[PDB]
From Swiss-Prot:
Subunit structure: Monomer, homodimer and homotrimer; these structures are stabilized in the presence of S-adenosyl-L-methionine (SAM).
This protein's name: N-lysine methyltransferase SETD6
Classification lineage: Eukaryota, Metazoa, Chordata, Craniata, Vertebrata
Organism, scientific name: Homo sapiens
Known outcome of mutating Y238A: Abolishes methyltransferase activity. Greatly decreases the stability of monomeric, homodimeric and homotrimeric structures
Gene Ontology CC, one term: nucleoplasm
Keywords associated with the record: Methylation, Methyltransferase, Nucleus, S-adenosyl-L-methionine, Transferase
Length: 420
């Protein structure tokens, strides 16, 4: 209302140009602020432009010099500490150049990320989805960074970081904010740090989106990808995001069947386990491990990775195909490979039942094992979803979690049907 007008004046001040066809709004959006079409917009049409000088990053912030100098000491797994420090500084700086931009940020105490749920609820509602494991990894990293890197830096520079921002609670919130708002510019292999992009981060997300961002030398442009009728919300794409990633990083899910990009994971070692099951002799077991190490050699599998299965097609396509091939090939043929190019081809809803029986059997057994990692079967979740009055009675978190589990189990059951 007031903050929106103030933000738009700031836009004018920093050269951020919005098309007259778009409006920043809180009415009729899927969530909080969003952008709507004042007038019908056509595909290819420029929606807005953001000068690179208006981005908020470790480089444009007022302590960019100090941060760059100390880059080595600020390294971490995420690579997000300098941006986080940039944010913590600007937030406590009396004359921050981005104040009107911050004014549109969500209430930091009300973020919906599962990292903010009680651990029991998280573990209970999201078992098997990959979220609980990702979150505990996040919390571990956050913890080490804070005590060994961030807090000491802030304390080494009292003038640049006031007391009110030396807060673990705040640090957690800002990590979540970066996860859900920041943009990472593609390279061209030292990946670009994430940056905050004003205006662009007003747009909500859909798998079926109608806008996307383009990078240029001097600016970022948000452009329409489909026509957008008058009064309709303008949706960016945050990526090809499965529900488990949306809930983890953004604190929301798309209800079924909306998320055409949804996926399920089969752990790579679970396929190995399935292969071992069918073995009888300890000598058969080791040929399996032999096959496995050859696949690790080829960098097609790894002890900690997962194959990724989409609704219509496998995403980790060559990895899975190459694994199935190598695991099911005659012992003889495998000798000639360990001595003397990877496997091509797609794996889709239509292709999979035409694969060799042995590949299908291996895939089938790995899927059964994956489905066993969840607390309940598909039928239970399908029951909660089919009856809308029962669904409506679940808490918000339970609804979100059910959508993650359901999306994943449906994909896995589809694959179960396809592999007979
Ligand atoms: C880049 S911000 C988008 C602007 C945001 N609506 C706001 O008011 O600040 C990303 C956040 O918006 C929300 N969001 C984006 N798309 C959504 C969707 N399709 N459904 C529900 N929430 C969504 C989530 O809270 C997510 O963390």
């Amino acid at each position: 209302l007031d903050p929106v007008a103030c933000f738009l004046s700031w836009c004018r001040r920093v050269g951020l140009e919005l098309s007259p066809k778009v409006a920043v709004s809180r009415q009729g959006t899927v969530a909080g602020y969003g952008m709507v079409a004042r007038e019908s917009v056509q595909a290819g049409e420029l929606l807005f432009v953001v000068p690179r000088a208006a981005l908020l990053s470790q480089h444009t912030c007022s302590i960019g010099g100090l941060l760059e100098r100390e880059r080595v000491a600020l390294q971490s797994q995420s690579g997000w500490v300098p941006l986080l420090l940039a944010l913590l500084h600007e937030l406590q700086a009396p004359a921050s150049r981005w104040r009107p931009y911050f004014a549109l940020w969500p209430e930091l105490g009300r973020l919906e990320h599962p990292m903010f749920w009680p651990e029991e609820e998280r573990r209970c509602l999201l078992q098997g989805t990959g979220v609980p494991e990702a979150v505990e990894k996040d919390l571990a990293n956050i913890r080490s960074e804070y005590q060994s890197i961030v807090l000491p830096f802030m304390e080494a520079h009292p003038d640049l970081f006031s007391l009110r921002v030396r807060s673990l609670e705040l640090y957690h919130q800002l990590v979540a904010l970066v996860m859900a708002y920041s943009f990472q510019e593609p390279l061209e292999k030292e990946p670009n740090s994430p940056v905050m992009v004003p205006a662009a981060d007003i747009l909500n997300h859909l798998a079926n989106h109608n806008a996307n961002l383009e990078y240029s030398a001097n600016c970022l442009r948000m452009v329409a990808t489909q026509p957008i009728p008058k009064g309709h919300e303008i949706f960016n794409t945050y990526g090809q995001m499965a529900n488990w990633q949306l809930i983890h990083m953004y604190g929301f899910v798309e209800p079924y069947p909306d998320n055409t990009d949804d996926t399920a994971d089969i752990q790579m070692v679970t396929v190995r386990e399935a292969a071992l099951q069918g073995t009888k002799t300890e000598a058969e077991r080791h040929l399996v491990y032999e096959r496995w190490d050859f696949l690790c050699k080829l960098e097609m599998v790894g002890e900690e990775g997962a194959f990724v299965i989409g609704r219509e097609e496998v995403l980790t396509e060559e990895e899975l195909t190459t694994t199935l091939k190598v695991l099911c090939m005659p012992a003889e043929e495998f000798r000639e490979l360990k001595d003397q190019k990877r496997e091509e081809g797609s794996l889709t809803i239509t292709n999979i039942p035409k694969l060799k029986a042995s590949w299908r059997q291996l895939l089938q057994n790995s899927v059964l094992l994956t489905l066993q990692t969840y607390a309940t079967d598909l039928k239970t979740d399908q029951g909660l979803l089919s009856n809308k009055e029962v669904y409506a009675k679940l808490s918000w978190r339970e609804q979100q979690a059910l959508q993650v589990r359901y999306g994943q189990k449906m994909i896995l059951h589809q694959l179960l049907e396809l592999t007979s």
